[PDB]
Amino acid sequence: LQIFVKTLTGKTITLEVEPSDTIENVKAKIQDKEXIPPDQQRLIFAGKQLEDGRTLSDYNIQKESTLHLVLRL
Numbered sequence: 662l663q664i665f666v667k668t669l670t671g672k673t674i675t676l677e678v679e680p681s682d683t684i685e686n687v688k689a690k691i692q693d694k695e696x697i698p699p700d701q702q703r704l705i706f707a708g709k710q711l712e713d714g715r716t717l718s719d720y721n722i723q724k725e726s727t728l729h730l731v732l733r734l
Contacts, residue, residue, distance in 0.1 A: 664717070665727045666691060666704075678717060685713035691730060705729040 664687075666674045676690045688699035704711045706720055706728055722728070 662724060664722060664725070666730050667727060668695075668730045669732070680718045680723070681716050683714055683716050684711045687717070687728070688713065695730075697730075697732065701733050703731040703733050705731065 662678050662680055663675050664678055666676060666687075668674075674691075674694055676687065676694075678687060678690065684704060685699065687704065688702045691697065691702060692699055699713075706722055706726060709720070711720060711728075717723075717726075
């Protein structure tokens, strides 16, 4: 499964994910490519800021969905 992550910079990164991955698991994937601590990340799907501990399925995030990475601090 693959989703896209955009950033304020606007660079489009793609991630390999599992449908039952938590948002916390997605932040740890972004950490490894980008160097940003999870607690500094904030992720929007379709205008909605996502809560860690919930899963991509919980939010109907599926092949080719785009998440928007925003930084806290």
